[PDB]
């Protein structure tokens, strides 16, 4: 009965801008290795986090595999790192799965790749890990130091941020 | 909810100076992290100290408490050295003046301006904790929330641990 | 007659991978501000270096403007930061201009953008600045910790480096 | 020409350690810069010391001289602390054993592992200097080549300057 640190959070990675990295062959960026693993490596965690790579790019098949992976996890606190362009569509899909009803599921990512100077990625990862641990069960987007309801959120391209959709 | 951030120095903020041939407490690293965070909402940062957290007196903790009480915000982050973080947190937890606020202390084991630092992760985690936790005083480090009354720094592990 | 530090090196910037940076609007890299200025800012220079931006991308017109700028400089030590894909063509062009005959002219750049993690850029800039100051008059490519003769150099794409062309 | 790199410690190599609550001389930063330099040619790196350059004795300088003499390479870079860089350089310049070699000393005013360091620029500049300069001993810092016999560190400027 010595103390055992639990590992209540599992992270799944689905690619996106957060993970982009330069390749000579492409003369540009590709979706690379998961940047969340780099951030957690130096986080001096008390426990650990289980990080599972799902994809590196989006068909209903791809969202369905994500829902299967999230639903089959033993953990009830889940972070999914993802591209911002279809994050709302994935989040809305996950919110329709009854098997997620007792889980806190947070999607996050970055507007700037983690491997590019001046990125929001490390901040967003810390914020989203906490959100996944602390929010009540449901599906959320955590970006810009804010929690978003997927049914009432859109990307504002001129602003470069997600914004809430006001009730009419 | 608007977040108020206070900076009290510590390892997180250390930076190299030629004159000292070593590290000193420099400008608050939380401002560098939040500059690139693309924040959607209400934040402001206030400097309180750059003094060594080992050199904080009961008078210094009383002045930090009064400064946090000056904020009308009910969500507070205080960046601080880890050496006496538990002493400041326990002091703040005893002030009836702060009872409606969520106050989170955080910092870093490695300076933000040194390679391989925990600082940016800790700032994001602690900002969320200050917005989401119920009223009280907490330490947010190591991807965990600690109760100050039941926490110590374990120098053998280089981490806070529960008592 | 107190000591005055000379500024014998002038730098011209013509863009390339070295200067690439992420933009939200593009969802990828563009040619950004000159990365050589960022490196020299923290170099604690004894003197200074004059950095002039020429272009951010290549027509004979573009090479001709570069030759005009280099030939009109008062300095006899010149570094041009440039993309690696046509560096040999620019260098060979400059080597044909008699008005450059007393100048040491070095071209350099980076295989990885300076603003991406793990870049060769800062090393290449320090190496190329020294090369421009120390080599005898002529036109050179300085990359990979090596000096290349433009008439006897090609990019080896499989290798990701310039290589010499052996005499037959 | 093959370059041999020797590492004698100094600010360039400093890194943060929890146990010290500050910087110590860590692993050689020149190895980190050259790992990403995509080098075309012949290089090797040899560790000599992590001892404080202020604490180098005449015996230590004699041992650095003998170590540089063990290299068959005629192009040498020695990374070193700036406090006694001029003393080591002047000592090496007097060794007839080294007369055919180009030996360049360099380092950094800011540790390579601290943000805003001169280290990577200084390493690239000093590698080129070691390949290109005529036989002799030099200091390569601040984008300049210094003659050790005619150089001092000006602590008021934070730069080497000619005498
Ligand atoms: Cl791209
Ligand atoms: Cl220190």
Author numbering:
A (entry chain A), C (entry chain A): 0 to 56, 61 to 171
B (entry chain B), D (entry chain B): 6 to 168
Extract from the study:
L‐Asparaginases (ASNases) catalyze the hydrolysis of L‐Asn to L‐Asp and ammonia. In contrast, the chain of ASNase from Rhodospirillum rubrum, reported here and referred to as RrA, consists of only 172 amino acid residues. RrA is homologous to the N‐terminal domain of typical bacterial class 1 ASNases and exhibits millimolar affinity for L‐Asn. Crystal structures of the wild‐type RrA, both with and without bound L‐Asp, as well as structures of several RrA mutants, reveal topologically unique tetramers.
Mutation of Lys158 was anticipated to impede the completion of the catalytic event by preventing the second step of the reaction that would result in hydrolysis of the covalent acyl‐enzyme intermediate (Lubkowski et al., 2020). RrA(K168M) was crystallized in the presence of L‐Asp. However, the density present in the active site could be modeled only by several water molecules. The methionine side chains in the mutated site were modeled with two orientations of unequal occupancy. A water molecule forms a bridge between Lys19 and Thr16 of one protomer, as well as with Tyr21 of another protomer. Similar to the situation found in typical class 1 ASNases, mutation of the catalytic Lys residue (K158M in RrA) completely inactivates the enzyme (Lubkowski et al., 2020; Strzelczyk et al., 2020; Strzelczyk et al., 2023).
